[PDB]
């Protein structure tokens, strides 16, 4: 096992702009909306698409009252029909009445994410229903990538592109064999900023679609795992990234960090019957403290009614799950404590001075490194978060946070494993003078760009 | 031929800070400089490893007098003898008396090199006459490894890695090949900024080690020429991506830009014996003007001596070399010239702002793209510069420039075609009011960032 190996595996400059967005919202749109259907079944008639009220800036409104960074439009699902007047198919809205057959769906979403501050990208599903091609190989290939130029170069920057793996073809169905590799080197060469996911190699499918966020989520992880959606560890093993998982890999491990997508309503796309099954604003919230507070970016799906709306549920989820994030980053942002550290205490101040570029790291001697963050007065608390420089690599293995009450006595107050961009630790509401953070199990010396303890 | 691909390949991020470099030097030092050899043996004695006044402040203060932005040294050239005291092997300078055996010159030199404001890079040989693993496959690419490891953990920040593909049969009489993807990925995930150079998908050799320049540098190109140092394409071909040399290759091309590199002596390595065939500075600045004025990195070598100093005649060389450049970059930037475009005349002042990150371009229908560059007084000119915002592509294809006299007549100046990064354009010195540059062809709207006239 080669800690210094390990310990210095570190994020591209998009995988780390990519972690900084935290969350960010998914948009499955289209024919499957029209049809009520989660999956298509291809060759639908384009005369179904005629949204009769489609208002993209009451979706943005609603993305960014509710703390998205971005948004993710489906442009093609698995049924085939495009977003967009693609050039290399009629099965595209050019060919629907909506518009007058004028319209362009990713165009008015793109347009609008920008005016709203909402960064851009794009679904382009690699399994199609309805296209011709599919199934021929290489004729295949050269439509999809023909599909993918359109979408890179017309529409402004992308920040991710989304690789779905999934394929209902069966034992009997159609079999392509995408050509993954010609595909990547287009996306590198039209949006070399952009994170391409999932059947990708900068963003990994966290393993499950229900919001479940693992106990200690390692971005370091088996190289191999950029192949597990593509065509025996998988997306879905709990332990990916333990030094007992990855010892036998040597250098063959690298940066995927995880992200975690789900669906406000059990379905993707908008289905009438599940109005009275849209998770609230706080089911939101503890998704997003889980998430984001675990080494997880979070892609949230909310889909567009038929009329073209996001529902009235929906909206009021998404307002509510706003207001709270806004609080806790401005609880987070305006708390004081002092920071004192068991070593190189000149760097202590890093800890908390709201710049996460600067960071505390103990000295390599030092056994037992902690922070601990006095606070002004005695304190109800129910969190500490803490932030590693994952610009540097990811490293801590377990922490252990002790509270000092003020009668004196100490209490456990609660431990953790990884760290990586955020943990945040929660525990009971507790009245405290100050926190001791024993970061107890390390790769090599941590890096800590935030310490602070709050209450949520 | 599709231009909607090929307008739009770009350069990822770190291709495109490597890019705004222009300028480094290769440092080739170590067993070879101490035997007198271009190649080593192998298996040369560790007590011939003793300069006795190695003094890298000396070296990078010439390199800061050449205008060097960074500095790339032989780590370990193909003979196998280590300049930094690995694990992996003794064939280093632990086994030197240099130092007494406690010496790292890697540390030194990248030490030195951030004092001074310098980028740092490794060169790494695949190569290897000494190791007693290569010639067995797997074996020495785990060696291989091992090295880069500590080469790129040990060192703070790496921005290039400089990969030379040669290769032997080892002691066992079988060829080593290079697990090179392996390679990809320790660098990819240790140094996410670094370049990763020849043998590499991130740098071009430009094709010859003589200094020669392309008429026409395209960093567009086909993607097989990734391969090409591990009729086909080779790296020495004059044509890589006019129209028709990449046309049949539809999207399977990308950002590959070239370094041009040399040395400024007969042999990569110091020998006493050319201490008077260094190039001069007016060699070195026609050198520096030929290929950072088309679209090339100048890499240029200046080996240490065995004693550890630059010489004295390569010193000054540099001396001069770096004056020539400073006065070119007071000519480029002291000329006050008003910019008048053919369209989008809102733009214009990009044209001379100075900031590479703002540009002009010209309306989709602006049939004649074209600047005019007027001076404050009639003045006499022999050159133009050109900037194309390369971050968004390589477009123009040809360029025309014309001079206004100033008792009225016009002089057609000269023409190139490429620009990418700069065209440094000369011609017969001549008095003009002003310049027009005319891109009469171009794949889609060309995007400048910089256009000047100047006295060389
Ligand atoms: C194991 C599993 O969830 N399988 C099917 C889903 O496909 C996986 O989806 C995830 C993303 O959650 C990832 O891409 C894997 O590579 C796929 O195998 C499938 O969901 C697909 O992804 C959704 C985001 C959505 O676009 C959906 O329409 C798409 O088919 C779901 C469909 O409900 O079925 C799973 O059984
Ligand atoms: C085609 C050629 O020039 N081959 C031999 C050189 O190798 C090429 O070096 C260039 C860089 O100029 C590039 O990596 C190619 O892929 C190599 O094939 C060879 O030079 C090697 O490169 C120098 C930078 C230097 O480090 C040298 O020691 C090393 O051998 C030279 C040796 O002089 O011979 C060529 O015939
Ligand atoms: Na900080
Ligand atoms: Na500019």
Redesign the interface.
Known sequence: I?L??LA????????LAWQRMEMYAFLHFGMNTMTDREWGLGHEDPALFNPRNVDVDQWMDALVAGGMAGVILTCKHHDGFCLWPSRLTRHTVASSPWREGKGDLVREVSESARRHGLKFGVYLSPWDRTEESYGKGKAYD?FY?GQL?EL??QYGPIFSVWLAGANGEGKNGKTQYYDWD?YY??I??????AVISVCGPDVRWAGNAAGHVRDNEWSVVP?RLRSAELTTVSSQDDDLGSREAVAGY??????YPAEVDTSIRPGWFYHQSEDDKVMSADQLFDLWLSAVGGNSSLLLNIPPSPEGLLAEPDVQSLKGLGRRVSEFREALASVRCEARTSSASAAAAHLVDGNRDTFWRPDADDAAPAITLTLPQPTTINAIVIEEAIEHGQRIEHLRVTGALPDGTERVLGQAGTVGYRRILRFDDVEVSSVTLHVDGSRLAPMISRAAAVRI
Chains 1, 2 share one sequence.
């Open positions: 080669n210094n190996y210095n595996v570190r994020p591209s400059s998009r995988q050269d990538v130029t890179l170069t010609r080197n287009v590198r060469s039209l949006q070399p900023d190289r040597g250098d063959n491990v690298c940066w």
